[PDB]
Amino acid sequence: LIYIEEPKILFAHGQKCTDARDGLALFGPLNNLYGIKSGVIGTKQGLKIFRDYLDHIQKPIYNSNSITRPMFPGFEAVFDCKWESTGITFKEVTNEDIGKFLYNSSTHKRTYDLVSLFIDKIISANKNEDENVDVWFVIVPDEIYKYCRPNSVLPKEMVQTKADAQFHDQFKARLLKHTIPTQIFRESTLAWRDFKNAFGLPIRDFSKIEGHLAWTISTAAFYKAGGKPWKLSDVRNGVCYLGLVYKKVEKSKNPRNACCAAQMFLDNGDGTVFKGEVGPQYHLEPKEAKALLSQSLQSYKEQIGEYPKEVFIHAKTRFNHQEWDAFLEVTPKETNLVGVTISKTKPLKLYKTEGDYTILRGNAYVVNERSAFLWTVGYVPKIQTALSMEVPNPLFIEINKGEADIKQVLKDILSLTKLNYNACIFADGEPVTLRFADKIGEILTASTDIKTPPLAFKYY
Amino acid sequence: IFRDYLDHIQKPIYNSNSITRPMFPGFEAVFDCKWESTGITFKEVTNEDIGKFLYNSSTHKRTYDLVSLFIDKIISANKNEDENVDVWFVIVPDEIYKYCRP
Amino acid sequence: AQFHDQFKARLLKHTIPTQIFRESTLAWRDFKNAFGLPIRDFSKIEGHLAW
Amino acid sequence: RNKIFISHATPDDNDFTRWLALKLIGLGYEVWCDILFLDKGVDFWSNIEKVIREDTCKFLLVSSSYSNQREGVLKELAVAAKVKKQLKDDKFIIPLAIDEQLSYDDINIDIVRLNAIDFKMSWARGLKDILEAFEKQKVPKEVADASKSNLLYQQIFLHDKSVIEKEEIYDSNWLSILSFPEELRFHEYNWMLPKRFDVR
Amino acid sequence: MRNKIFISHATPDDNDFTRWLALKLIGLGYEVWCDILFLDKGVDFWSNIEKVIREDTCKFLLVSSSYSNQREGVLKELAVAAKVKKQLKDDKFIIPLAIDE
Amino acid sequence: VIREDTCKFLLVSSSYSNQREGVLKELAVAAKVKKQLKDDKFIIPLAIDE
């Protein structure tokens, strides 16, 4: 077990620290933006949720343990950008129209119409109205998500209305045509103080997490405004990451029909994605395999100027000869390409005999030059608490095809543990190219009528 | 030209006479906004790249081609890029609209 | 034949506000004719024009 | 005269002062606080006088429900009232009201007349007004550099929060097999074992 | 409970009147606090005067003079008393005594 | 000695009774016991020096 050092993430004025929460709270984001225009919709009551607690976000929200839960000074103090009660294009969604829409007994059409009720209001607003909305903000009530969701279940206490399936992915996918980033909130993500959902205790959240709960809420609502909070430095140039996860497209027919949403992270600090191909087993046929690389790898030609020297394509699935051989002659010539499969295949857990806390994260157990493990989850020296409360498991990282120094490989996956622009955590337990390709894989499969270029994260 | 003009209207500039052609104290002092050389999204369309499409003589086809060079970048940056732009400034040279005019 | 219409009409699918500009309207100072007197005398308007 | 002395409750205003001082160090100022130094001890008292009477140019005092009626803060504040006197600097003590529970009518007499810097509603505008006030008063300062705050962050607030070269032994969930049976025998039972015998 | 009638003054400039005041005032029965013959000596002057003003003071009787108006120590008493006067919502909390002719 | 029966601390506030480490050591010990003895009239710094 040689220890892999914890990586670094940059912040304002080119500085380099190690914590996303701590660095922003003290240093700030890299790019300088002035203000954020918050196009906000939702029910009339929900307006009294977002509006006041939005003012709490630039107030100092304290943490009981500044070590484990880092500081949060505000919003203008941390992000150097202004957020205020202006631009609030409150498209009042009456509960009576939702009432005749929410209680429908259908599975998809209940979500299809209810999403459409939210969609047609925001769409016209960015078409006709006079706000420069950057982060669209759709506050969704509680009863809708409790009823309208995957395998939707509705009890029979107040039955009045009668007749993918997910609310979130259908919402995001439709806006790819309209090209608007949007933030969606559910339950008491904001109104946890006075919710007392089950009983008096706020079962959703707590004051301890509130210090960095508003970190995740703010950082999710900050990156979509064209900002660049933190960017990597230890990732070298000329290296292409293709984090791809095969996603089942249908739930009823053709179980072997699937599509892959291959992310493509650049060397110039671009968390770019790419559209893969629909490959019908569990493999990308050369018809689709050639198209992926010839398109995803092509972006280096105009984004930088030349093809990357190394191409680290990531996956949770092993390859076979047909996919890999297609990946050679389609485009990559004189440029290295390596297929790395990262998965929690077999549980190898390590336990510390002397002492009580769990294994520190960053441990790599060699098995071969082309296979090892990576403890990207576990104890953190800085926050003095393990990222995973339970005993963690490593990422079985083996080089399926190609030859590369796996120790050089291992610290590179660890490098992609902090580009997690959906939460404020010290490190994410998966590479960003593989973690963020699951949601976009879920977005691009919500509908079958999208022509998506290599779109960035903020719409997903 | 923008690197001259864009920050030129931040400072006050006096015309020949302010009674008929009034001066303005500047963008920050008048319009109460920040608008400077920051967030610039220089996307160079090289003259050889423009010339390789401008050299076509069929105005029924060339004029559509010249716009097609511009929009494809704009929507790409709008969708498949990270940078945010509020108002886009297509600085088409006088030669572009000299020939592609009725 | 003027690309003004097609350029802005093609962004209606994208709905991005593009301010069409020109070198003459933005580079009055460095533009000079053959005889030495520029055709566009935008100097005096460089007030309410910049408005 | 460069130090910006911060008076506050030791364990309570740490969150703000750690923010404020490291912002002040981040903005380039030099700040004394009881949490910006290690190997302390005799440094407390008998050197605070030297760092205040000869090095402290501005006294940014943290006003809060915890700093109010505290032996350490009041004593340091009483010094600030005196240290303001020999030099011709009436704007040497600058209060900072942070706690919401501390009403503006419960402010101690040493800073009642002094125009405080508001932080309760928002820490950002208070930090900015801190900057403009120093610029207007020509407060001595160096170039802005947040690496000093990071250095003060990693050296002080990350001192015993790093990795150390130490040999450890970890137990796992793998039980290695020592030896195996000598031969794996394929028993050639041609139509001798039943076809559907379920050999399991 | 605020029953001590705190009377503010500057230096020993007034002190010969204020005990003359007190020896009639505490002579007649008013609980009178002064920073000369009633100040706790050997303790904080600054913290004590605030402690009585903020909590123990019932009435604020400042003396006016050419030497009891521009002094910072005296001005310190008026502002906190005024803030306490704001808390008490009594304008007549501060009662200037025009002692000097 | 200080914890037992130090009583008051009437210090000679001379021009040279402040930089000395010994008088401060008594004062520093006095400072700790002052909170330990929860007293406020503990120190009486007699200003003798003209």
Next chain:
Amino acid sequence: DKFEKTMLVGKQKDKNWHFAISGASKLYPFPVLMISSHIFFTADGKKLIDSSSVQHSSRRRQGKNWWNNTWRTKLLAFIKYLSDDDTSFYLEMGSEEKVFVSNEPVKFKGNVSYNIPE
């Protein structure tokens, strides 16, 4: 319910928790008998709770107070409970065939750690 001063089965509110292991033999990286750690719950100590969601919920709330030591001593004691004579544990393939497997999990060495700052 103790093996070498190690409690393997205990109490949690009204649900009795039991430490359980799942063994999957692998020839990679080297011939091993890979073990997994699980907590399973019985209403009266003899019948498992026939509710996967409840068992999942109970296991999530039973490991709440279980740290690295609580996991490892329970695992090693249960594994050492399967030890045959002194330092191994045989798997019987025949009347004379046996596969001795070590009772002590494979040790690994690391040169970087934290200082245990309480």
Next chain:
RNA sequence: UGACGGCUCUAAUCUAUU
């Protein structure tokens, strides 16, 4: 879907033998 964990539960498939 603020989220990151951890496991837990299902299903499918490639690879050879009734």
Next chain:
DNA sequence: ACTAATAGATTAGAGCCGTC
């Protein structure tokens, strides 16, 4: 023909919790 296979060793969904 592959009809069934019972195991290898991968492979997503996907609800459920815990609180970094």
